[PDB]
Amino acid sequence: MTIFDNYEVWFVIGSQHLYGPETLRQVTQHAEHVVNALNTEAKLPCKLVLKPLGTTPDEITAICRDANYDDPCAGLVVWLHTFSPAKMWINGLTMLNKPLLQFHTQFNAALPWDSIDMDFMNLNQTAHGGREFGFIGARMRQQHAVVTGHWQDKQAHERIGSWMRQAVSKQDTRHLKVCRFGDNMREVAVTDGDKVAAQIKFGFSVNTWAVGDLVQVVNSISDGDVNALVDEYESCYTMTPATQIHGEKRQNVLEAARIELGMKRFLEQGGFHAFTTTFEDLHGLKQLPGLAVQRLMQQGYGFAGEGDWKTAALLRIMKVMSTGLQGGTSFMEDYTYHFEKGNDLVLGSHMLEVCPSIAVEEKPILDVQHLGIGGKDDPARLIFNTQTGPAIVASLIDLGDRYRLLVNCIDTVKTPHSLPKLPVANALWKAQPDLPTASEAWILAGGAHHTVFSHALNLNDMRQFAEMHDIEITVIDNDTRLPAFKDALRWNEVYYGF
Amino acid sequence: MTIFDNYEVWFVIGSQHLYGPETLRQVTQHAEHVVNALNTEAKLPCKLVLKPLGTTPDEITAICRDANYDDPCAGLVVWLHTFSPAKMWINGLTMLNKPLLQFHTQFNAALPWDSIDMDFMNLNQTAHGGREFGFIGARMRQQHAVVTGHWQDKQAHERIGSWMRQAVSKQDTRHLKVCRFGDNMREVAVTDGDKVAAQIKFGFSVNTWAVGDLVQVVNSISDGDVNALVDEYESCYTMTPATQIHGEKRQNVLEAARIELGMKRFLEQGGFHAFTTTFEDLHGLKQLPGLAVQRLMQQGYGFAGEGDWKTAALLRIMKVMSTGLQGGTSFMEDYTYHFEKGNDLVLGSHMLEVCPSIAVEEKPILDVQHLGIGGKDDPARLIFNTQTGPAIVASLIDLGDRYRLLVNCIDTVKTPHSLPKLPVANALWKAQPDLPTASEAWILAGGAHHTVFSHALNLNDMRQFAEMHDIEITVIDNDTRLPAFKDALRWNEVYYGF
Amino acid sequence: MTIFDNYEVWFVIGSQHLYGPETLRQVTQHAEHVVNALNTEAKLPCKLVLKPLGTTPDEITAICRDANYDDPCAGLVVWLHTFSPAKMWINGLTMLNKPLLQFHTQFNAALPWDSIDMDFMNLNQTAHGGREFGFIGARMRQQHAVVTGHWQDKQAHERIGSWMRQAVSKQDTRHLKVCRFGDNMREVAVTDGDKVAAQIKFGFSVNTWAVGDLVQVVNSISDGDVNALVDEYESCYTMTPATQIHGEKRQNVLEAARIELGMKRFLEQGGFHAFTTTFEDLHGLKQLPGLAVQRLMQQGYGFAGEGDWKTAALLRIMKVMSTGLQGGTSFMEDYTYHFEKGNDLVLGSHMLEVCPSIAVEEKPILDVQHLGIGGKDDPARLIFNTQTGPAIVASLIDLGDRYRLLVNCIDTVKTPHSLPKLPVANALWKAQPDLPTASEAWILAGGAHHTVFSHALNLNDMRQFAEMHDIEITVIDNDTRLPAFKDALRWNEVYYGF
Ligand SMILES: [Mn+2]
Ligand SMILES: [Mn+2]
Ligand SMILES: [Mn+2]
């Protein structure tokens, strides 16, 4: 059912004819054996298709050429069962659009001390065949990945599997379409940037439909379709008295529903995966989309507030990326602090748009709905608490000449006293290593007030993403120390400054 | 005896023409003591020749003129006795083509508290005088190693001699001559490169003589001389049943012996110090040089397989580097692996060519050969085990615009079982910090399958080597971590990308 | 029959739906009309295949994806009949392996002053639609070409056609295989270099077979096949008395013939397009290949003397490139000068290997054959004079970090007195602007003694090649003036020094 099922990774084996052609026939036995046992037992994010052996230049070019042409081909994992003169690969590697991982593995785990002979020695020579390959890729500054490990090693499966994840994320982004409903909040910098650069670098496109284009779909929906969706609320969520049938703010639940249907139909018919809104342009909408934006985020779409295409895009990438994983992933603003010796905290939220995928409960749908901001009707919104434990918050910023991705490892924690006046969903966390330093470093390194929160993905996941896209990663966890942190900033600046 | 008897290090001393033939003659006295003290007591790689005092610019410029012209001057060791304003050193240091080391030292291991005068402070004042000199070395951006200590210091003797050792290596490489017998294995990358560039940088030359040429010399050796060498094989090694008289492959031993004599004679007359071969071009040679190659490696000749001049030269270099040290140093190629929790191992070896320099025993010689590779006669070889202990493998790769020296720290270990069918000698080691990262880090950095294995030389030797040549040293050892390693590869790329 | 017939160029029209879909239908009428009239009447180097209109992002990605996959697709020529929002093209353009030329043309030549209206105005808006496209390509630093001109403009056809030429040259080079028969003349720099860099940058591969591998094929040929080829000589060429049946050097014509057959069979069975020899390794050959190398160059193969793969490669590229053109293209060494007020000259040649494609006559096959060099039998060689008029000489050199292509516009001229002792073919020329300055500049800018001479190609042809491959071109013709010439060298050095 998932987008992972719309891709497969190619298992290419490198060798040469020198010994052959029955020395090849063993190689093929191994490959087919390792491919089946992985597809069967290694619980990897998507499928491995074994291609015919690459033992000549033309065979290797062929495979890369094919890999570029096949839209499901998300990456290559190459095993060099033997020596494989690396010049053979050059012409293929210079046309390759798809990512590559060397699986520096071997058929046997134990070296058969008592039996080993030259036949053996000259078969399963990945020990050196993998190093010849290492070189050309390094020589070309072509970022190839490596996992060393025996082919049944479950630790390897993970790192292999974790890489397959990024391959698919990289190709989905190459089709991701953000639909903004208006422009950036006036006078705001971070949420602005060069959209051309984004689509060049990342392949996702951002383009603006009039709020009025939406309003038209938003107004067109049938009551039959509205009251249907109104039922799915009462089913799913705790309705606060104000929200119930005879409640003075029932009518506002109707307007929420339609804005959900309206946005969903516009977004499906447009073929979109993400979107923005701006409270400075809600002409023809009854209320700022809250409930609707929250549920569309649960249903999968990327979103960010006030025109913020980068963060909205990012959310969608990290959701997709998170498929099959234990948690969350939500848009998030760092809203307010709690200061105390030992217990410094952040509380995250926005005006309304907090995704219910990181919640732990059955979730109230109250109004208590004054939003002076926007200047519209009291909006519907889901109110909830965020799950505990170790998360991350990611901010992608545009330094103008390049992008930088900041990640701050964090730990959600339970609110000690509850928030009875606060009509928004919360997320409360301690920022590794500690607020003052965590905040300082983030601020030092730019990094928006807009972030993507996530329980399901982590730092190592994001490190591979940063690699896969060739961008700087600015990491802020417990190891962070400002003198070193600053040096890195400088040294990365020169490096990525080409 | 050995090549360290060819070279010398000059012992220059720095003061000003002002003032006091006493003071200025009084200083001459100490340099004559420390030098004589060091030359009999210190056990340094080669002698220290004291030179007349650098008091004026012209004298320093002369000292440099001579130091450049004198082909056994391996470098200057400089100690700044009184105080020698560095503007005097300019014209000299500017022309100085031989390496320099500031031995930053005093007269006198401790301090006269009641016996201190201005007459004393006039003369012998390296504390400040030494610093001024570092400045100009830094300003001009020259190397200038510095060792600080009291001359009588055991630790400081050690430090200076290791430098002296490198200084001499630098000079020997200048005259090093590789001789290639055929070209690279077809379609191979790591072992190709720009010979012109290497000769510019390190000064070693690489030029190829026809396989046909060698054959002419091999086909010329007298049966008398051939037989005589075999008498040396009987006495050196453990001749296997087939190897000895009435042996089924006794002639293969003679042919090997003939080859070795021809190859030797050839190399000697052409004044060569290293060589390569290629199994793809052996026309006129009865079998692929194995035993011949091994004993020649053991006698001091650098070599590396299938046309690999870089590694071949590096072997010769490191072999000379290691002179007067306990331990082996060999050509080596990661051949296969043993994956076992806690005990990941690499079996090193080559087709035939491994140096008995690194062996534990009196070596067995066998034929049990059938080398499918090439397609020649069952060739002779020395089978043996590699010693137990700390070692390094090193590779010099050409990245197009610059060279990179990779060195992995390792620890060789007893084969836990005999290897009865392995027709070749072996090395066996655990890689620091562990196989997967050891291997992965090397692949990320490129780094040949061909390496120079050494028991005698260490990371520190190679560190100075890399500094001495201004090449990047990539270091894989117990302290390695992939995030910092990767960072260093990027931050170095832009440093040395100049 | 020619390799041009194995490729086609794609004619892609960019537009958008804004007006459509019958506004598109006109666009298609135009495109089909312009494609037919060009394929019919424009005598272009190869075929134009009109692809379906690109009016959306997915359609544009599709076309580029297809262009990469189709091996005959040599380049794209895009016409922007209307405005074509350039973001649509980004994702296609970021995957494109093939070269692109914008044909900034229009359907009508004259603006129909009296009739023009908005319908018209908004159709045929290439005036601005072409500038939107210009931008993205410029923004991406993607070297796209442009010819502006009406679509019937014959001057345009040329510049379009001239570009199509380079597209095909660029793809052939991506399959060109040099087969060296040995290594570089010892101690020679220019002919040496980094073969990995070449195959990366250019896609042609260079790899060394043993002279003995050839000798085996060289010796295997049948007399029936030898004497057959001996007849084709007497037919084609003037046989000097020494060369005739009872001539004392007839036997040497037999050995020439076999070396021709032998080299031709080895080269066809290897699938090669170019080759080198080295006189320092002719073990098993009767005489240095002269006659044979000359005729194989006429038949099409690239060649250069003494191991020189770059120049041999280049020759083959410039021959292929020259298909369908008036002249020549030959390997060439600048052999000797004539100095005289007003009449300074160069005479070009090699020991033997001068291609008879630039000759004007029926061509003597004498021996007068002492070649002390090589140390072999008196060789057969064709002796001839070169055609008059404006030519070029191209040298591709490896500056180590990058390549530079030098071109010197020259003018062949008739020898005033004849060369009765000189047993080699001549080419005599004046080097624009004049020997002293022409020689100086060439020497200043490096540039080998080995060149490719050519009557058929020129400077503008080579300028597009240099562009198509992104390398420096150092031009030396009449406009050349050393102060400016030097400045350019410096300014290009910084630019291409990334
Ligand atoms: Mn906000
Ligand atoms: Mn090898
Ligand atoms: Mn020549």
Please give the DSSP secondary-structure letter assigned to residue B14: B
In this complex, the chains that touch A, judged by 3 or more CB pairs closer than 8 A, are B, C
3-state secondary structure of A184: coil
Cβ–Cβ < 8 Å for A198, A397:
no
Answer for the pair A121, A67: CB distance below 8 angstroms, yes or no: no
Half-sphere exposure of C211 (CA within 13 A, CB side): 26
Q: With an 8 Å Cβ cutoff, are C212 and B284 in contact?
A: yes
Residue A306 C-alpha to ligand 1 middle, in angstroms?
Answer: 6
Alpha-carbon distance B126 to B119, whole Å?
15
Tokens of A492: 């990365």
Strand partners, B425: none
Alpha-carbon gap, residue A358 to A456, rounded angstroms = 9
Question: Does residue A146 sit in helix, strand or coil?
Answer: strand
Beta-carbon separation of B281 and C184 below 8 A: no
- Rounded distance between C-alpha atoms, residue B173 and residue B468, angstroms: 12
For residues B449 and A129, the answer to whether their CB atoms sit within 8 Å is yes
Coil, strand or helix: which one is A467?
helix
Question: Residues of chain C whose C-beta is under 8 A from some C-beta in B?
Answer: 180, 182-184, 186-187, 189, 192-197, 205, 207-213, 215, 280-281, 283-284, 398, 400-401
Long-range contacts from B299-303, C-beta under 8 angstroms, 24+ separation:
B300/B273, B301/B267, B301/B272, B301/B273, B301/B274, B301/B275, B302/B176, B302/B178, B302/B273, B302/B274, B302/B275, B303/B274, B303/B275, B303/B276, B303/B277, B303/B331, B303/B353
CA distance readout (Å), C482 to A443, C368, C433, C479, C485: 54, 43, 11, 10, 5
Task: From chain C, pick out residues whose CB is under 8 angstroms from the CB of B184.
Answer: 208
Q: Measured between alpha carbons, how far is C250 from C260 in angstroms, rounded to an integer?
A: 16
Q: How far is CA A109 from CA A48, A120, A145, B346, C350, in A?
A: 22, 14, 22, 12, 59
Q: Which of C281, C285, C398, C498 to mutate to test the interface with B (most CBs of B within 10 A)?
A: C281
The token pair at B379 is: 């060739």
Kindly identify the ligand whose nearest atom is closest to the C-alpha of C450: 3
After which residues is the backbone of chain A broken at C–N > 2.5 Å?
none
Q: How far is the CA of C450 from the centre of ligand 3 (A)?
A: 6
> Contact A318/A281 with Cβ under 8 angstroms?
no
Distance from CA of A317 to the nearest CA of C (A): 17
How do beta strands C450-454 and C389-398 pair? antiparallel
- Whole-number Å distance, alpha carbon A289 to ligand 1 midpoint, is 14
| B-C contacts (CB, under 8 Å) | 77
Pairing of strands A472-476, A403-412: parallel
* Cα torsion through A266, A267, A268, A274, rounded to 10: 180
- Which helix (H) or strand (E) segment holds residue C475: the answer is strand C472-476
Rounded (10°) CA dihedral B345, B349, B351, B357: -170
Instruction: Determine which of B280, B440, B485, B495 to mutate to test the interface with A (most A C-beta atoms within 10 Å).
Output: B440
A24 to A55, A81, A83, A112, C310: CA distances (angstroms): 9, 9, 12, 21, 35
Q: Label each residue of C327-390 as H, E or C.
A: CCCEEEEEEEEECCCCCCEEEEECCCCCCHHHECCCCCCCCCCCCCHHHCCCCCCCCCCECCEE
In whole angstroms, give the CA distance from residue A386 to residue A346: 13
> Which residue, among A175, A199, A445, has the nearest Cα to A317 in the 3D structure?
A175
Is A232 annotated for ligand binding?
A: no
Is residue A490 classed as helix, strand or coil in its secondary structure?
helix
Q: Are C180 and C307 in contact (CB under 8 A)?
A: yes
Q: For A243, phi and psi rounded to 5 degrees? A: -85, -20
| Nearest residue, CB atoms, A200 vs list C140, C174, C195 | C140
Nearest CB to B183; choose among C183, C193, C194: C183
User: Are residues C273 and C302 in contact, defined by beta-carbon separation less than 8 angstroms?
Assistant: yes
CB contact under 8 A, A65 and C65: no
Chain B hits for C194, Cβ within 8 Å: 192-194, 197, 398, 400
Q: Which residues of A touch B487 (CB under 8 A)?
A: 488, 491
Sort residue B161 into left (φ over 0), alpha (ψ -120 to 50) or beta.
alpha
- Please tell me the distance from the alpha carbon of residue A225 to that of residue A217, in angstroms, as a whole number: 13
- Kindly list the distances between the CA atom of residue C292 and the CA atoms of B216, C253, C266, in Å, as whole numbers in the listed order: 27, 11, 13
Give which of A49, A160, A153, A75 is closest to A107, Cα–Cα: A153
Q: Is the peptide bond before C416 cis (omega within 30 degrees of 0)?
A: no
What separation in angstroms does the CA of A131 have from each of A125, B336, B451, B471, C195? 10, 12, 11, 21, 19
Judged by CB atoms closer than 8 Å, whether chains meet at C95 and A91 is answered as no
Nearest CB to B189 within list A109, A117, A136 = A136
**Are residues A87 and C203, on separate chains, in Cβ contact within 8 Å?**
no
Ligand 1 center to residue A350 CA distance, Å? 6
Chains adjacent to C (≥3 CB pairs closer than 8 angstroms): A, B
Say if residue C280 carries a ligand binding annotation. Answer: no
Experiment used for this model? X-ray
- Asked if residue C187 lies in contact with residue C284, where contact means CB atoms within 8 angstroms, the answer is no
A469 is in an annotated binding site: no
One-letter amino acid at B316 equals: R
Q: What subunits make at least 3 CB pairs under 8 angstroms with B?
A: A, C
Q: Which residue in C57, C174, C498 is closest to A91 by CB distance?
A: C174
A327: alpha, beta or left, given left = phi > 0 and alpha = psi -120 to 50? left
Annotated ligand binding at B187? The verdict is no
Give Cβ neighbours of residue B94 (< 8 Å, ≥ 6 apart): B140
Query: B343: nearest CA in chain A?
Result: A110
Summary count for chain C: helices (H), strands (E) = 15, 16
Using CB atoms, pick whichever of C90, C91, C97 lies closest to residue A95. C97
Ligand nearest to the backbone CA of B311: 2
Q: Residues of A with CB below 8 A from C195's CB?
A: 87
- Return the number of other C-beta atoms located less than 10 Å from residue B111's C-beta: 8
Which residues of chain A make contact with C57, given a CB cutoff of 8 A? 205
Tokens coding C295: 């005729």
**Secondary-structure breakdown of chain A: helix, strand, coil percentages, each rounded to the nearest 5:** 40, 20, 40
Inter-residue contact B214 to B332 (CB < 8 Å): no
Are residues B407 and B459 in contact, defined by beta-carbon separation less than 8 angstroms? Answer: yes
Please tell me the distance from the alpha carbon of residue B344 to that of residue A74, in angstroms, as a whole number: 32
A413 within 8 A of A459, measured Cβ to Cβ: no
Q: Which residue has the tokens 């390190």?
A: B202
Please, are residues A20 and A85 in contact by the beta-carbon 8 Å criterion?
Answer: no
Of B197, B212, B280, the CB nearest to C283: B212
Residue extent(s) of CATH 3.40.50.10940 domains in chain A: 1-175
Q: Is the CB of C401 less than 8 angstroms away from the CB of B398? A: no
Nearest to B436 by CA among C392, C21, A277, A109: A109
Residues of A at the C interface (Cβ-Cβ below 8 Å)?
57, 65, 68-69, 87, 90-91, 94-95, 97, 136, 139-140, 174, 195-196, 199-200, 203, 205, 207, 498
The whole-angstrom distance between C407's CA and the closest CA on chain B is 24
User: Hunting for tokens 């690194």 — which residue is that?
Assistant: B358
Range A95-105 burial, b when 16+ CB lie within 10 A, else e: bbbbbbbbbbb
User: Which stretches of chain B sit within 8 Å of chain C by CB?
Assistant: 180, 182-184, 186-187, 189, 192-197, 207-213, 215, 280-281, 283-284, 398, 400-401
Residue with tokens 């630039």: C358
Residues in chain C with CB shorter than 8 Å from the CB of A94 are 200, 203
- Alpha-carbon distance of B358 to B354, in angstroms, equals 9
Give the nearest partner residue to B210 out of C180, C283, C400, using CB atoms.
C283
Q: Is A76 exposed, middle or buried (0-12, 13-18, 19+ CB in 10 A)?
A: buried
Resolution in A: 2.8
CA distance B388 to A368: 77
Q: Which residues from chain B sit within 8 angstroms of residue A100, using beta carbons?
A: none
Q: Considering the domain delimited by B1-175, tell me its CATH architecture.
A: 3-Layer(aba) Sandwich (3.40)
Are B494 and A498 in contact (CB < 8 Å)? Answer: yes
